């Protein structure tokens, strides 16, 4: 019953709203019960959208998300986007920075007698193993750990005329060429 998959997390973990719904109507950006609105402010929401075009939850949701929802609201998220040109949804996941943030907001209380570097370290040895009971530990034979079948090669040869030759990959950038984009 292993469930630490990517597409299966969306296919099976569906049909229930612990989510955060987004809202778009081609000019504003919104999620949840938001009194306000976000315009095309690339200082913020493009940092968000960069992550959400991938499947990573940003590092920063966690503490507000935790203090907001007491349960049934975490582990991961899915976001509810719907256009006005349909409705769409797609999944986001941790990155080990979200997980390290899951240790930070635990530090605003009991800073003393907490053995931080010990306890909050050993916590991860259990958590990381428990999140992931699906690893792929399976070998396969090379030509190097057996015998009688070592192959031949002809790149590092010795011409009679020239000294030796090698394998060296191929760009298109030449010398005395245009350096890069404009200065703006």
């Amino acid at each position: 019953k292993f469930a630490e998959t990517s597409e299966e997390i969306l296919h099976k973990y569906e049909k229930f709203p612990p989510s955060l719904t987004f809202h778009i109507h081609e000019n504003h950006y919104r999620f949840g019960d938001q009194d306000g609105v976000i315009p095309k402010n690339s200082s913020v929401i493009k940092a968000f959208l960069e992550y959400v075009a991938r499947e990573e939850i940003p590092p920063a949701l966690i503490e507000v998300t935790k203090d907001a929802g007491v349960q049934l609201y975490e582990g991961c998220i899915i976001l509810r986007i719907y256009d006005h040109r349909k409705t769409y949804t797609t999944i986001l996941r941790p990155t080990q920075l979200s997980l390290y943030a899951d240790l930070l907001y635990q530090t605003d209380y009991l800073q003393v007698r907490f053995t931080d570097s010990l306890s909050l370290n050993i916590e991860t040895e259990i958590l990381t193993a428990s999140k992931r009971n699906l690893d792929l530990s399976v070998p396969l034979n090379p030509h190097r750990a057996t015998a009688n079948l070592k192959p031949e090669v002809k790149y590092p040869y010795y011409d009679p005329e020239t000294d030796t030759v090698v394998h060296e990959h191929r760009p298109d950038a030449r010398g005395n060429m245009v350096n890069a984009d404009t200065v703006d």
Partner: protein, 336 residues
């Protein structure tokens, strides 16, 4: 393939009790290589693949290739006219060296945040590499070639290729220095071990840590992987070898021995039946590994899982290399 099928059935009949079943333990042979006259100016050794050369990285930017069994070390050129080849091209001490499994190249890390590549048909550098902010301890190839990895004091590890000159991936999960790096036999995982008394695993594509193993009051220095994909070895200043299972994240066994000294190097068999530790208490220590594991091979007549210990003439030992065959091959220093 009718007679072919009958002969395949005959091979299957050989499988019935004519083919060996267990391949139980087998106590090893050894051949030692003590390096005299160095004034302790010597960090690492490393042996070849087909067991013809042994390279030692000194502490003044020097790499002194040695030839076992003769002096054929001559270039293919017309110039460059005994069997010891010295490599320059470095600024600081050398801490790790590794060979190419096609065995016409060589890689060598240092404390001057360089990684460098050498040929072996001209004994000559080709490339320099720089993406690291601090000393690089150990550099190891992939089991297949093409990709190599490094460990540093910058509390991070970088996985390189050989064609591209700047790193491809950077791995960051250590609250102290990453002492050692190794690749699991599929070549899609890396095991870092550190002075923070913890060990970690990484997906080269992902970047981020699949598993973390904690124990071992003390540092870490060397790691090993058993060929079949269950088993990693943790060796550290604590002097207790720990065998770890990747899926469990909890050590299957805790081999106890080796007095009270740092354990510098270790290795498994060709078929995972046996391992070997190798230490600074002037002793090597063969351990059985299947005494209490999921394959309890016992074969009956301080703690157990300890077949034999071979002492040396006041020599701290630095490495091993199981050959294809039964025997080990060792490297130590200090003579008497």
């Amino acid at each position: 393939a009718q007679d072919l099928r009958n002969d395949i059935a005959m091979i299957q009949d050989s499988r019935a009790k004519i083919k060996l079943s267990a391949a139980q333990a087998s106590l090893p042979s050894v051949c030692m290589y003590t390096f005299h006259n160095t004034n302790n100016d010597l960090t690492c050794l490393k042996f070849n693949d087909d067991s013809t050369m042994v390279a030692s990285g000194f502490q003044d930017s020097f790499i002194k290739l040695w030839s076992i069994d003769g002096s054929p070390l001559r270039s293919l050129l017309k110039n460059d006219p005994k069997g010891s080849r010295r490599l320059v091209g470095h600024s600081g001490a050398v801490y790790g060296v590794d060979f190419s499994p096609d065995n016409r190249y060589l890689i060598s890390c240092s404390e001057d945040k360089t990684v460098r590549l050498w040929s072996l048909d001209t004994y000559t550098c080709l490339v320099s590499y720089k993406g690291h902010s601090s000393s690089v301890w150990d550099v190891k190839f992939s089991p297949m070639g093409h990709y190599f990895a490094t460990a540093s004091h910058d509390q991070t590890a970088r996985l390189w290729s050989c064609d591209h000159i700047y790193p491809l991936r950077i791995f960051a999960g250590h609250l102290n220095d990453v002492d050692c790096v190794e690749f699991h036999p599929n070549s899609t995982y890396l095991f870092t071990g550190s002075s923070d008394k913890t060990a970690r695993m990484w997906d080269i594509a992902r970047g981020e840590c699949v598993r973390v193993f904690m124990g071992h009051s003390g540092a870490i220095n060397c790691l090993a992987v058993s060929p079949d994909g269950r088993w990693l070895a943790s060796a550290g200043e604590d002097s207790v070898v720990c065998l770890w299972d990747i899926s469990t994240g909890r050590r299957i066994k805790a081999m106890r021995g080796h007095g009270r000294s740092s354990i510098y190097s270790l290795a498994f068999s060709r078929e995972g039946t046996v391992l070997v530790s190798t230490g600074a208490d002037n002793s090597v220590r063969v351990w059985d590994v299947k005494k209490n594991t999921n394959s309890p091979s016992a074969q009956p007549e301080a703690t157990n899982d300890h077949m034999s210990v071979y002492f040396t003439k006041k020599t701290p030992v630095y490495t091993v290399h199981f050959t294809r065959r039964n025997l080990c091959l060792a490297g130590g220093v200090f003579g008497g």
